[PDB]
């Protein structure tokens, strides 16, 4: 179970699809 | 990998207000350092991925 | 004028245990489902409480260290405010509160008060309800005055059938002056009733003086109704708060019980 | 442009192929707004300089000012006061000042006395009876009442000070009637040689000079900020703005951010909204009773994507979680421009076809620099 | 107070009573013109304005 202030999350290259076509 | 993450240190310590940054001015290099430490986190999130 | 009864002596207090009472919003700040640190004057969660009672009739002064937790359960309007000061004899400023039959007054004037001073259901005195007086000689510095509605008004609950509690903090800080209420309806004989509710910042007024001690106001060779009073003390003290969907205080913890 | 941007940021005259960070993008402020309660306790400057009859100087009145707004508006933008002047404060500033008690002390002199009244002043009215403090940092104010308090026969109702023991410490007023000792004698019953009564009326009949005519006399004054501000000028206020980044101050809470109307509801005590991190999302028009969610300006990291210096100049920027509706506030030229999950894209055409991963943008999105 | 005070007054020394915003540093103001610190314009010498 899982932007403010100048702080900033940035997403991973590979999106959870991405992952799930390797895997 | 965990979440990556970057900072505008100037918003961050100074938010808004103009002041403030030229008296940040006065502490040189450090609102970069930090951003090229951050930025070397976040590439490596997807290297390990 | 003064209308002296020594009439009992200085009975010892009886004591109670406060459960869970006497929690405030600290602030005017709206939160939602999230755990609140609030760090402040607080009355310690089940700490002794002193409690009176009014043949049966209590009013004595005690002093006001810091700030103070008030309460009754009645019927049928017995009580109508407090004196709040430090000397109470006009070498100092002084702050009334009254309630009448809707209104409030809330004032600070070089007051001289009495031994045992009080305001009863006026039938006579000068005349019928004669006006916010008799508690006092002459103000002669009323600098602050201020009024409203139904400061302790009155609810339906089938014409209030149950002793209705009636519960107040009153706070000091930075010179202003500081008041939260709630009002609920509960069944019990005599004793401060175990559950949990918060109380709201009802009103604040920037009077700025030294205070120490505080006396109840209350109302009748004559005849009277009959209900109980209780005091506690605010001590320092951490709370963690739980804000609800809604944002009004639902749940408390003392962080040192 | 862009390309020069990396070259200062990288400090170098060349740049390699890859995604270079540059100074941050942020939506500016579109306006000011200030937000406050309209105007209620106007202060009750009426039962000052328009009560109908005055106090005589000799025993001038005070009133005790408290709990109010000291609005100056219709006071000092009006001419109809000959001699208004303040003493450590602008009259301007007032607005912009606040206090903690105030008083008006209220009487009617001659007009040859207006001057003595003004701290560090003599003569009988300022020896004798009304002194201000040479530190006295209020405000004298004064009007030409010729029309008002002469009598025909001269109104004598109206009384001073023509005698004193010693000059007087500030606001002294004194009631004594006793009789003066101008000799060396000791006064004895109501008059005598060198024996005097202390005071005197003034003749003010609708004839008299600029000079024997009767002025009205206020002097406002303050004890200053040793305790809360219970007396203040107006704080304004201007229009509600919406759906915009605004620099708000709402009831004295700063900051810069978009307001949009809120789902949440209040309980009427309450006036800013908390986050789990203790920072403001939400506030209360304090005119209208509504809540308005506050929401940080669009801001991002600039990256700037290039193939390398020698190989090419061309180069495109990623503006990190921006919407693209929002970069054209800033290259708003566009024509092609991509809105990706990683942010706005900017002078990088869109390919259908999937090749391998070159320059990493994020979220699937790769860049390289081809036919 | 020897060198440049007078028995009735050294009425040649003058300080600068008002101005529209704060002088900027080593900023001189030689303007003699009216302040006009009410509305009412003073397209004029004098006036309680
Ligand atoms: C003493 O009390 C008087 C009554 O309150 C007050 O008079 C009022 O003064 C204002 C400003 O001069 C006038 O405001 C109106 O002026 C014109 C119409 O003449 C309009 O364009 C404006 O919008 C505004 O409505 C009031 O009309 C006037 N009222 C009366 C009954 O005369 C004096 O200003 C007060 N004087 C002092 C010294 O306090
Ligand atoms: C009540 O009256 C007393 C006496 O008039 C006030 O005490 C004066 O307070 C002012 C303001 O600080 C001082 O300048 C005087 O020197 C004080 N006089 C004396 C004799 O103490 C007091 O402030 C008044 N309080 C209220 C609330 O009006
Ligand atoms: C927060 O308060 C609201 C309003 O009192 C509650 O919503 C009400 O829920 C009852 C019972 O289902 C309905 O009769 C009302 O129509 C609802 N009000 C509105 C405005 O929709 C809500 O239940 C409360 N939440 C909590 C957690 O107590
Ligand atoms: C502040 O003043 C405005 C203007 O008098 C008030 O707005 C009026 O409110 C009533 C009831 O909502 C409406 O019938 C009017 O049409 C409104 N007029 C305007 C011009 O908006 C407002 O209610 C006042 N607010 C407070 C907090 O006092
Ligand atoms: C960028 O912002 C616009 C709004 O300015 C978003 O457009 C809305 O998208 C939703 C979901 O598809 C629709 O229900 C709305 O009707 C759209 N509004 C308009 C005005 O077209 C857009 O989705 C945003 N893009 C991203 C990826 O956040
Ligand atoms: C509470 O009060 C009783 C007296 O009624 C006393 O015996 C007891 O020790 C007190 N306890 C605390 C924790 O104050
Ligand atoms: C009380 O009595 C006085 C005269 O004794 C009278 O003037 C006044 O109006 C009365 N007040 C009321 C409320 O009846
Ligand atoms: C209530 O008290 C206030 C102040 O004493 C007074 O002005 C008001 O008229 C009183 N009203 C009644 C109903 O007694
Ligand atoms: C009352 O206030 C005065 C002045 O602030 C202070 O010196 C004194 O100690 C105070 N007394 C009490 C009992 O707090
Ligand atoms: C540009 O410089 C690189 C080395 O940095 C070299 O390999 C390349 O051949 C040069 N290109 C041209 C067009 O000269
Ligand atoms: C590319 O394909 C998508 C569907 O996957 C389509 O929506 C888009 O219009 C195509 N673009 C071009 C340039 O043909």
């Known amino acids: ?23 | 990998s965990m979440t990556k993450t970057s900072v505008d240190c100037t918003m961050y310590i100074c938010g808004d207000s103009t002041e403030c940054s030229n008296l940040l001015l006065q502490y040189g290099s450090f609102c970069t350092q930090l951003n090229r430490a951050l930025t070397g986190i976040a590439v490596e999130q997807d290297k390990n991925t | 004028q003064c209308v002296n009864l020594r009439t009992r002596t200085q009975l010892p207090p009886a004591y109670t245990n406060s459960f869970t009472r006497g929690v405030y919003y600290p602030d005017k700040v709206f939160r939602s489902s999230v755990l609140h640190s609030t760090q402040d004057l607080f009355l310690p969660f089940f700490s002794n409480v002193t409690w009176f009672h009014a043949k049966r009739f209590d009013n004595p002064v005690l002093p006001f260290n810091d700030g103070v937790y008030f309460a009754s359960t009645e019927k049928s309007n017995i009580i109508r405010g407090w004196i709040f000061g430090t000397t109470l004899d006009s070498k100092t400023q002084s702050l009334l509160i009254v309630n009448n039959a809707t209104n409030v007054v809330i004032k600070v004037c070089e007051f001289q008060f009495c031994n045992d001073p009080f305001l009863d259901v006026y039938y006579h005195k000068n005349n019928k309800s004669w006006m916010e007086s008799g508690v006092y000689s002459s103000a002669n510095n009323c600098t602050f005055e201020y009024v409203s509605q139904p400061f302790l008004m009155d609810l339906e609950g089938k014409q209030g059938n149950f002793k209705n509690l009636r519960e107040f903090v009153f706070k000091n800080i930075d010179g202003y002056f500081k008041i939260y209420s709630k009002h609920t309806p509960i069944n019990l004989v005599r004793d401060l009733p175990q559950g949990f509710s918060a109380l709201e910042p009802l009103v604040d007024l920037p009077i700025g003086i030294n205070i120490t001690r505080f006396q109840t106001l209350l109302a009748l060779g004559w005849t009277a109704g009959a209900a109980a009073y209780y005091v506690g003390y605010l001590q320092p003290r951490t709370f963690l708060l739980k804000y609800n969907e809604n944002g009004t205080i639902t749940d408390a913890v003392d962080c040192a019980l | 442009d862009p390309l020069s941007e990396t070259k200062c940021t990288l400090k170098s005259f060349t740049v390699e192929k890859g995604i270079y960070q540059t100074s941050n993008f942020r939506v500016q402020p579109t306006e000011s707004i200030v937000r406050f309660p309209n105007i209620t306790n106007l202060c009750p400057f009426g039962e000052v300089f328009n009560a109908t009859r005055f106090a005589s100087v000799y025993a001038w009145n005070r009133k005790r000012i408290s709990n109010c707004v000291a609005d100056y508006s219709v006071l000092y933008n009006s001419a109809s006061f000959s001699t208004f002047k303040c003493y450590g404060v602008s009259p301007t500033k007032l607005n912009d000042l606040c206090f903690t008690n105030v008083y008006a002390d209220s009487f009617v002199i001659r007009g040859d006395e207006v001057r003595q009244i003004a701290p560090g002043q003599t003569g009988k009215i300022a020896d004798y009876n009304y002194k201000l403090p040479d530190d006295f940092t209020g405000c004298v104010i004064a009007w030409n009442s010729n029309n008002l308090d002469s009598k025909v026969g001269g109104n004598y109702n109206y009384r001073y000070r023509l005698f004193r023991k010693s000059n007087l410490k500030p606001f002294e007023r004194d009631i004594s009637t006793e009789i003066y000792q101008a000799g060396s004698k000791p006064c004895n019953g109501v008059e005598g040689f060198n024996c005097y009564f202390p005071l005197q009326s003034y003749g003010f009949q609708p004839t008299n000079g600029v000079g024997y005519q009767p002025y009205r006399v206020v002097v406002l004054s303050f004890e200053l900020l040793h305790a809360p501000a219970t007396v203040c000028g107006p704080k304004k206020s201007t229009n509600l703005v919406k759906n915009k980044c605004v620099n708000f101050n709402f009831n004295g809470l700063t900051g810069t951010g978009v307001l949009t109307e809120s789902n949440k509801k209040f309980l009427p005590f309450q006036q800013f909204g908390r986050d789990i991190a203790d920072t403001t999302d939400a506030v209360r028009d304090p005119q209208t009773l509504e809540i308005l969610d506050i929401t940080p300006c669009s801001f991002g990291g600039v990256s700037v994507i290039t193939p390398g210096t020698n190989t090419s100049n061309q180069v495109a920027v990623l503006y990190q979680g921006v919407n693209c509706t929002e970069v054209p506030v800033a290259y708003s030229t566009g024509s092609n421009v991509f809105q990706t999950r990683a942010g706005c894209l900017i002078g990088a055409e869109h390919v259908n076809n999937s090749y391998e991963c070159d320059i990493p943008i994020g979220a699937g999105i790769c860049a390289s620099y081809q036919t």
């Open chain 1, 1 to 23: 179970t899982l932007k403010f202030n100048g702080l900033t999350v940035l997403p991973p290259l590979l999106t959870d699809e991405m992952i799930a076509q390797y895997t």
